[PDB]
């Protein structure tokens, strides 16, 4: 059992997410990704289940290459809601995307909590990923 | 032959947020030039902004990854951002699918400075915001 999963577009991967995955293991914290890749046609639902299953939270990358994926609204929004343990665990981070772009791919997402890699670098987000798995793990 | 707005730009912007936001305010009443502000290695930012305020009211700069990845310097950034005319800043940079992580490696001076931001403002937004400063300083 690990402390984070990175799901994200293939896009995203040598990328933000690497750089992400490092950043947190350079902070104690054990995080993987690679088999949380959606391609289209996967399935949102089954591979956030396999993710929390195995780790205490899921950060899902919001780039225009997933949004473009065209999920549900459902799959979206019971994303944004899964709860474990007695909290919140899938974590969104918009990442090099438009507001125009989710309003017109994943209108649901518009509204829901995210980071923000334009307004937080890797660190703010390390820094904000540490306070909340502190406040629920210790 | 006066315009309300020219956008600076790299190419890579060109066909996409560039295009889009010229579209969005010629729409809503304003005049837009951009036709002659792509921005390459080796252009001048202070003679393209020039040049541009030369018969244009304010400068639109795109600040995505392939502006900063041109590497001005700190004095030509700051120059920039801090262009005044009539007494008041002209230049409204853009922020656009970038990082922070990005404007700090490549255009570290201009991470404090006021931005728009198409991941938080959606061009209507920024369509507003434009229209109630042009009206303000213009009408």
Same mark, same amino acid.
């Given at each position: 059992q690990?402390?984070?999963? &990175?799901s *994200?577009?293939?896009?995203?991967?040598?990328?933000?997410?690497?750089?992400? /995955?490092?950043?947190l293991?350079? @902070? %104690?914290?054990?995080?993987?990704?690679?088999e949380?890749?959606?391609?289209?046609?996967?399935?949102?639902?089954?591979?956030?289940?396999? %993710? =929390? +299953?195995? /780790?205490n939270?899921g950060?899902?990358?919001? +780039? $225009?290459?997933?949004? !473009?994926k065209?999920?549900?609204e459902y799959?979206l929004? %019971?994303?944004?809601?899964?709860?474990?343990? %007695? *909290?919140?665990?899938? =974590? $969104? &981070?918009?990442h090099?995307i438009? !507001?125009?772009?989710?309003l017109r791919? +994943? $209108?649901?997402?518009?509204?829901? =909590?995210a =980071? @923000?890699?334009?307004? *937080?670098?890797?660190d703010?987000?390390?820094?904000?990923?540490?306070?909340?798995?502190? *406040?629920?793990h210790?």
């Amino acid at each position: 059992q690990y402390d984070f999963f &990175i799901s *994200h577009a293939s896009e995203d991967k040598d990328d933000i997410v690497r750089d992400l /995955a490092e950043a947190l293991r350079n @902070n %104690g914290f054990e995080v993987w990704y690679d088999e949380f890749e959606l391609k289209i046609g996967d399935s949102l639902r089954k591979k956030i289940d396999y %993710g =929390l +299953s195995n /780790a205490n939270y899921g950060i899902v990358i919001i +780039s $225009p290459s997933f949004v !473009k994926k065209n999920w549900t609204e459902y799959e979206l929004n %019971g994303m944004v809601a899964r709860e474990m343990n %007695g *909290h919140k665990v899938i =974590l $969104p &981070i918009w990442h090099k995307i438009t !507001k125009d772009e989710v309003l017109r791919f +994943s $209108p649901s997402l518009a509204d829901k =909590l995210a =980071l @923000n890699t334009s307004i *937080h670098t890797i660190d703010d987000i390390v820094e904000n990923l540490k306070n909340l798995h502190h *406040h629920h793990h210790h």
